[PDB]
Structure 1
């Protein structure tokens, strides 16, 4: 359904893309979105879908908009205009307070420190799967891995995983019992007592560190800590689950690429970057704080603009033959983790999860494919994704380390 065209929007800029239901989604998610980058589509379009909003289609505009929070505010980062978590909706300077605190728990020093634990987690999961000759990767690995990482960082017991999976799944891939707000309230109900306990008796886990931290020169409030912890959980789940699934979907179909990495495991870090570019999956945006002319288009105060992280690396102006995966690309240009002051706090952690996943999987289960008869179903939205990923392999071609 199509919102009436505001009269400040030129008719020749209307391209009614629906980011929740794009045409030709069976060609793939990134292929569906790349319709925005065909040669006749302008750099900046208006869609009448989802209330009406702008979309920037090219990397150059996406980057520039993300570098200018004065005009393009995070106060309303999601489309449609109708979720608290911190610091998603904050601009600097206040956002910097929460970046500093989050860095204490998912920053590069913690990620370097955790590398061996992360490898062990991955190996344990993969070794459990190896003899079975099949799995639904999305459920059997892609979700358990990052959630177990969180339980480890946050000092939370293994027995709570099912409950947290359930609530986080209702938030992001809703089966339709719970609304988003109900699911979020339940997540808060779980965190609140833990935060209170760890302010009264702190440990050295991530919830203790966030919950006894400082912002603006005073102790963080329990409610701020709750909103930060909720994002540190949901932010590393939806994206990692779906991104790992996209990547393994591709490797299941691509024997030469798999073989490159089996024979030359030193190329995995480069491959991770190239998969990050090809299978980019986030699309959020910003709200205009004032009337502003941008690239020959007059934007109005209050207009929302979609600045799809996904699109920058798919832009043929940024990477030749962008739909091709080339692990040897000389410069992999992308904004998969975003750009500007909100660039993903988890970016280091995410790369180590992807690299460890690829290294540990290919060393044990080098040869696998999509289950016969399956057709992989995709979803599009703020975080685009894979519904399920049935894989099969011959256990006789595997190896236990």
Structure 2
């Protein structure tokens, strides 16, 4: 499980962290990654896991490297190397300058003006899902809400049938948290197999859905190619199916465990947007990276062309050098420093949709089910990867303490 140490890597920088199965996982996935920020651990380490790669452990370095696309390229942005090599989504597998023209098209389908066309439907689905669960006095939150709420909104946006969710969700998860049955390349190709006939159909007969808009789009005034459209749509599916889905479960687990924070938002609902931001910091969940374009000395460490570096978006906001008492959730925190939605030229385009889904969930859940807890005797298990998540989140409550709107 440990790749031979490259000749240029010194032993004193070796820390064999496994991003797909970190040793301290039972403590919580954020806690497990935060072992990289213990006082004896250097700012930049090499792990022999997952083929061997660097890890920047501190916000300062993570931010610097995300800004410097000349040295730290997105051409191979996933670990392990085979995944990064196969990864060809647009815009994420591109560096500036070529990357930038594709962002505007992606903005047309997932950006703020769209969140606006979707506002009422987002609100309606959250309320309907929560009301359906409310009288039961229990739910399996991952399957009962965290998945169907954002995924059904995405499938609506993309004009895709809801009965396709199990297949698409399985494939997406193999790209971020592989079970071992499929390589990244096999999962990606299966996703493209799905998207190919649909992109063709919607270039022939355009609708108003996101796939039609991307497939018939222009990038800096020239037509998108069918294959650029495919590479963008694949990314949109992964964002739709495996980001907010996981984040909602970290947030709801925290609220189930912290009646004081629930009460704060019930009594002071105007604090919900700020709470969303603080939860985005504390339960940050993404970690991808970059590949070195040249030999480069970075913070006193010799990096070689072709070396991969994991730059965990998750870690910046958990760094005590960015936020004091970083594991503490404080909704009144004055400067909430984080890179949860990335940093540099690839800043998340889905972040407005994500925040709306989070804020609607917090408001509409606490309106109906203010008082809830983790199920008796349950120990909540997390899972780690490119995007981390919660395996299961059984919640209970007394229906007498709930409110039908």
TM-score, length of structure 1 as denominator length = 0.95
- 1:53/1:163 CA distance change after superposition, 3 Å: closer
Give 5+ residue unaligned stretches, structure 1.
none
Distance 2:234 2:59 in 1: 30
- 1:24/1:178 CA distance change after superposition, 3 Å: closer
- 1:186/1:16 CA distance change after superposition, 3 Å: closer
Distance 2:235 2:292 in 1: 24
Identify the residue that residue 227 of structure 2 maps to in structure 1: 223
- Compute the displacement of 1:174 (Å): 5.4
For the 8 Å contact 2:177–2:387, the answer to whether it is kept is no
- Compute the displacement of 1:210 (Å): 0.4
- Compute the displacement of 1:85 (Å): 2.2
Instruction: Please identify, of 245-254 and 184-193, the stretch whose mean Cα deviation from structure 2 is larger.
Output: 184-193
- Compute the displacement of 1:304 (Å): 0.8
- Compute the displacement of 1:15 (Å): 1.5
- Compute the displacement of 1:128 (Å): 1.3
- 1:181/1:72 CA distance change after superposition, 3 Å: closer
- Provide runs of 4+ in structure 1 moved above 6 Å: none
- Compute the displacement of 1:233 (Å): 1.2
- 1:107/1:131 CA distance change after superposition, 3 Å: same
- Compute the displacement of 1:307 (Å): 0.6
- Compute the displacement of 1:348 (Å): 1.0
Superposed CA RMSD in Å reads 1.7
- Compute the displacement of 1:241 (Å): 1.3
- 1:164/1:78 CA distance change after superposition, 3 Å: closer
For the 8 Å contact 2:44–2:54, the answer to whether it is kept is yes
- Compute the displacement of 1:224 (Å): 1.7
- What are the Cα deviations for residues 32-52 of structure 1, in whole angstroms up to 9, with x where unaligned? 111111111111111122222
- Compute the displacement of 1:216 (Å): 5.2
- What are the Cα deviations for residues 251-278 of structure 1, in whole angstroms up to 9, with x where unaligned? 1100100110111111010000000000
- Compute the displacement of 1:285 (Å): 0.7
- 1:196/1:122 CA distance change after superposition, 3 Å: same
- Compute the displacement of 1:236 (Å): 2.5
Distance 1:99 1:62 in 2: 22
- 1:61/1:218 CA distance change after superposition, 3 Å: same
Distance 1:182 1:303 in 2: 24
Q: Helix, strand or coil for the counterpart of 1:79? A: coil
Distance 2:290 2:195 in 1: 29
Distance 1:45 1:182 in 2: 30
- 1:183/1:17 CA distance change after superposition, 3 Å: closer
- 1:64/1:375 CA distance change after superposition, 3 Å: same
- What are the Cα deviations for residues 40-95 of structure 1, in whole angstroms up to 9, with x where unaligned? 111111112222211111101110100000000011111110x3322221111111
Instruction: Please identify, of 168-177 and 277-286, the stretch whose mean Cα deviation from structure 2 is larger.
Output: 168-177
Q: Helix, strand or coil for the counterpart of 1:94? A: coil
- What are the Cα deviations for residues 256-306 of structure 1, in whole angstroms up to 9, with x where unaligned? 001101111110100000000000111111111001111111111111111
Instruction: Please identify, of 204-213 and 170-179, the stretch whose mean Cα deviation from structure 2 is larger.
Output: 170-179
Q: Helix, strand or coil for the counterpart of 1:46? A: strand
TM-score, length of structure 2 as denominator length = 0.94
Distance 1:106 1:165 in 2: 19
- Compute the displacement of 1:112 (Å): 2.9
Aligned counterparts, 1:245-264, within 5 A: 245-264=249-268
Aligned length: 400
Identify the residue that residue 108 of structure 1 maps to in structure 2: 112
Q: Helix, strand or coil for the counterpart of 1:280? A: coil
Instruction: Please identify, of 385-394 and 312-321, the stretch whose mean Cα deviation from structure 2 is larger.
Output: 385-394
- 1:17/1:309 CA distance change after superposition, 3 Å: same
Identify the residue that residue 20 of structure 2 maps to in structure 1: 20
Instruction: Please identify, of 147-156 and 349-358, the stretch whose mean Cα deviation from structure 2 is larger.
Output: 147-156
- What are the Cα deviations for residues 110-148 of structure 1, in whole angstroms up to 9, with x where unaligned? 113322221111111111111111111111111101111
Give 5+ residue unaligned stretches, structure 2.
82-86
For the 8 Å contact 2:294–2:306, the answer to whether it is kept is yes
- 1:397/1:350 CA distance change after superposition, 3 Å: same
- Compute the displacement of 1:179 (Å): 5.4
Instruction: Please identify, of 276-285 and 179-188, the stretch whose mean Cα deviation from structure 2 is larger.
Output: 179-188
